[PDB]
Curated annotation (Swiss-Prot), chains A, B:
InterPro entries according to UniProt: Aminotrans_V_dom (IPR000192), Cys_dSase_SufS (IPR010970), PyrdxlP-dep_Trfase (IPR015424), PyrdxlP-dep_Trfase_major (IPR015421), PyrdxlP-dep_Trfase_small (IPR015422)
Primary localization class, coarse: plastid
Stated regulation of activity: The cysteine desulfurase activity is stimulated over 40-fold upon complex formation with SUFE1.
Biotechnology: NFS2-overexpressing transgenic plants have enhanced ability to tolerate and accumulate Se and may be used in phytoremediation.
Catalytic activity from the UniProt record: (sulfur carrier)-H + L-cysteine = (sulfur carrier)-SH + L-alanine; L-selenocysteine + AH2 = hydrogenselenide + L-alanine + A + H(+)
Organism of derivation: Arabidopsis thaliana
Full protein name: Cysteine desulfurase 1, chloroplastic
Length: 413, 413
């Protein structure tokens, strides 16, 4: 019995009919579904020991604080951070990138300083750095794609110079499904004194991530993509860097002392956590980490490689389909998603008919990567994305339904 | 059957023993407990229709989006906002104040411009304005207290001048339990062209709040204090004002278009909601609003006035107790909390012993109001804070336990 067939039971939401058909959920890149263990953790928090954290003294507050801080350690261990104090809790990866942009970027970047991104970057990795650029006079250098539709790594390399102060790029693309060799990139960046921010939203849920191995300076991720609740994510940052950084959000809990004329600030990570945090959600994220760890991230990744390949092979066998990004092989890895279009058909029509007539859930749009879609010559793409609760059966159902959907719209032509 | 005795059943957490004693929770000003209705909403979201929101098409996504936006309307209705688009979702009131500080403050405050606050302000007010002052040359003006330990309204009004750009003050104080005449203050501020930001963290959970009546420009609150989940809060802002303000956090969803060289931004509230929001938590906050509305905010306020008065009377009857803030009267209304100290005893000792020996949960510290405590001549106070699930029996138990605790520490003297 495959991994997907073994774990499906844990995810209550998968066992329903939508629009008359068995639900087939293929939108995990937009957000993931939650196992009972995580939901249980969340309910247990609110039912039994909810109270505000830090400075609290009383039994419930002490327990809430202990569990909140243990969750921070769980996340630390998940990505192999050396110290749990290098983990900062935010609402999502987006806010975590903004934290870096405001706190680190506004205080380190000077006119002429260069920040390197790729054209495949998610909006949350583009927009904050545009804003910093506008404020500091720093300039964004974009890495275009090669013929295999992956960021041109040769074109990344010679972009790195003594003027480069930051590289901010995906670990795995949410559209192309391709990866970047972060570890090498970090070496090249450090060689000129530049820092590296890793947008790890599509790697943290799906494969082993070791921030000490990568040696990345910053790393970001969202709970909602990794079986955890919405409303929380995190910033990993090297202790020495966090310590060098000024506060972003101000208020309760992040101060040491407050006087009328000025305040002094706590050390990281508290320095960066203003006011009452998402306590229950942090605890449930910890439960999500325990859940994924229990299955095992190597196991999840090997399973995803298999179903990902299966999806790619079956999808690409349909005529008139183009799948964006690299071909899978011995050397080139793909995440378990495919972004695609079908000749003469609008992906929104595909997604709508798939949902309404077949109960298949995919997404249509630019997937927060508008310049990428621009570069590839389209305004939108259809995207089917998998997680470890999906099965080859799901892929088979998708392919049958997609073939039907294409047949339907082509019948009027 | 009193309100507290009728609703206690809804709150699973109150029915336990801690340290061998029945729990008596008197720390609702730090955070509130959650009724089953709210927890059910949260669980139902994750089990049945979790999916990312906006741009989604498929059945679960449509439902999640409908419920997420319906929750925004529930909040807008709760505070009588004229338009649901005047509600912006944040992590907490602290972030909402920071949004105003960064987006409105940095773009509108010039050297010499003044911002008025009181010495009783929460840190999440004080710190963001301090930082804005440091960046813009603006100057903070603090309102001191009068003989009745309430911010001196005469001094407040006299500070209002052509140089006043913002008044940022609490509706109700989280320490003093006193309120400010916000509607009146708004009139004086608008007459010199200043804006008013209302820190409504301690009013929204406890009394009818009507932003059109107050006519305030900004208002903030946190979900966790009003029977809702941690991880979400909101900014209310006049539509015209929100439209004039630049983006704070950047990334997905808050954009209209993204190009390599620049981005255009959505209109409010989307403009200020970057990346995947706390979807489940917003929906549960809507359930909290429904739950409070079902009881009735007038019933709640009337009940709190009764038990607040009872607590004040019983507490002030104990020798050597000093309660901070104004005395109850028909003129002066207090929120249902008391911050206090006992002659010669440290409040941390009182809180620790109350918890360990009596299962009574209160808080000791500066309650994020360190300048207020400094003003009053202490570093910390004990605080007992009630909500509508507390009863006169709870107050009785507190008073019995407090007298014991005082007796214990004074026995070594």
């Amino acid at each position: 019995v495959s991994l997907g067939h073994r774990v499906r039971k844990d995810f209550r939401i998968l066992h329903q009919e939508v629009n008359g058909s068995k639900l087939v959920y293929l939108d995990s890149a937009a957000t993931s579904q939650k196992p009972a263990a995580v939901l249980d953790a969340l309910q247990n928090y609110y039912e039994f020991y909810n109270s505000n954290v830090h400075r609290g003294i009383h039994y419930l507050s002490a327990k809430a604080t202990d569990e909140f801080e243990l969750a921070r350690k769980k996340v630390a261990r998940f990505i192999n951070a050396s110290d749990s104090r290098e983990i900062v809790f935010t609402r999502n990866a987006t806010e975590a990138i903004n934290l870096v942009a405001y706190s680190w970027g506004l205080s380190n970047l000077k006119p002429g300083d260069e920040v390197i991104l790729t054209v495949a970057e998610h909006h949350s990795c583009i927009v904050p750095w545009q804003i910093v650029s506008q404020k500091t006079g720093a300039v964004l250098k974009f890495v275009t794609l090669n013929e295999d539709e992956v960021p041109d790594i040769n074109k990344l390399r010679e972009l790195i110079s003594p003027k480069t102060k930051l590289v901010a790029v995906h670990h795995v693309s949410n559209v192309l499904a391709s990866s970047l060799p972060i570890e090498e990139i970090v070496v090249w960046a450090h060689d000129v004194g530049a820092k590296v921010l890793v947008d790890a939203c599509q790697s943290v849920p799906h494969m082993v991530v070791d921030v000490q191995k990568l040696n990345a300076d910053f790393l970001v991720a969202s709970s909602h993509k990794m079986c955890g609740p919405t409303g929380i994510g995190f910033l990993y940052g090297k202790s020495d860097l966090l310590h060098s950084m000024p506060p972003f959000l101000g208020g309760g809990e992040m101060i040491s002392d407050v006087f009328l004329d000025h305040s002094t600030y706590a050390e990281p990570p508290s320095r960066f956590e203003a006011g009452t945090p998402a306590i229950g959600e942090a605890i449930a994220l910890g439960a999500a980490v325990d859940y994924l760890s229990g299955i095992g991230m190597p196991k999840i990744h090997e399973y995803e490689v298999e179903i990902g390949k299966y999806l790619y092979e079956k999808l690409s066998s349909l005529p008139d389909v183009r799948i964006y990004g690299p071909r899978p092989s011995e050397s080139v890895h793909r995440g378990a998603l495919c972004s695609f279009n079908v000749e003469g058909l609008h992906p929104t029509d595909l997604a709508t008919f798939l949902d309404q007539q077949h109960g298949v859930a995919i997404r249509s749009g630019h997937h927060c990567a508008q310049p990428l879609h621009r570069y590839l010559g389209v305004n939108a793409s259809a995207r089917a994305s998998l997680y470890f609760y999906n099965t080859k059966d799901d892929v088979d159902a998708f392919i049958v339904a997609l073939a039907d959907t294409v047949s339907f719209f082509n019948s009027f032509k």
